[PDB]
């Protein structure tokens, strides 16, 4: 139909607009702290603790197979990338300090994603 492929041109420009926050919030952790998924082999503990493990290449592959519907699926996997890291990790360390400045920084981004997302629909 007429109808499914205008529903398929907004989630094209929704993957447009997400893969542009993405790149914003990936420049916020220089250290690449957050870019590839906690190794198993070298954290074989790892899913003991963390039950839903999250990173930005694993978003990254979501994001290109059009597999997030709306702007808080998004965010909710940003926020467990974040969570994660603040709970495994303890307060004194480089990777929970990394973690504390990406939400820090990545609020203000987020904050007009969502409003370019009401605004253009």
Same mark, same amino acid.
């Given at each position: 139909? =007429?109808?499914? %492929? &205008?529903?398929? $041109?907004?989630?094209?420009?929704?993957?447009?607009?997400?893969?542009? %926050? @993405?790149?914003? @919030?990936? !420049?916020?952790? +220089?250290?690449?702290?957050?870019?590839?998924? %906690?190794?198993?082999?070298? *954290? +074989?503990?790892?899913? !003991? #603790?963390?039950? #839903?493990?999250? !990173?930005?290449?694993?978003?990254?592959?979501? @994001?290109?197979?059009?597999?997030y519907?709306? @702007?808080h699926?998004?965010?909710? !996997?940003?926020?467990?990338?974040?969570?994660?890291? =603040?709970?495994?990790? &303890?307060?004194?360390?480089?990777?929970?300090?990394? &973690?504390? /400045? $990406? /939400?820090?920084?990545?609020?203000? *981004?987020?904050?007009?994603? /969502?409003?370019?997302?009401?605004?253009?629909?």
């Amino acid at each position: 139909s =007429m109808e499914q %492929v &205008a529903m398929e $041109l907004r989630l094209t420009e929704l993957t447009r607009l997400l893969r542009s %926050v @993405l790149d914003q @919030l990936q !420049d916020k952790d +220089p250290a690449r702290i957050f870019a590839q998924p %906690v190794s198993l082999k070298e *954290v +074989p503990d790892y899913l !003991d #603790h963390i039950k #839903h493990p999250m !990173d930005f290449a694993t978003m990254r592959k979501r @994001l290109e197979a059009q597999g997030y519907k709306n @702007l808080h699926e998004f965010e909710e !996997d940003f926020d467990l990338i974040i969570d994660n890291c =603040m709970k495994y990790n &303890a307060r004194d360390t480089v990777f929970y300090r990394a &973690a504390v /400045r $990406l /939400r820090d920084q990545g609020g203000v *981004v987020l904050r007009q994603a /969502r409003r370019e997302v009401d605004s253009i629909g």
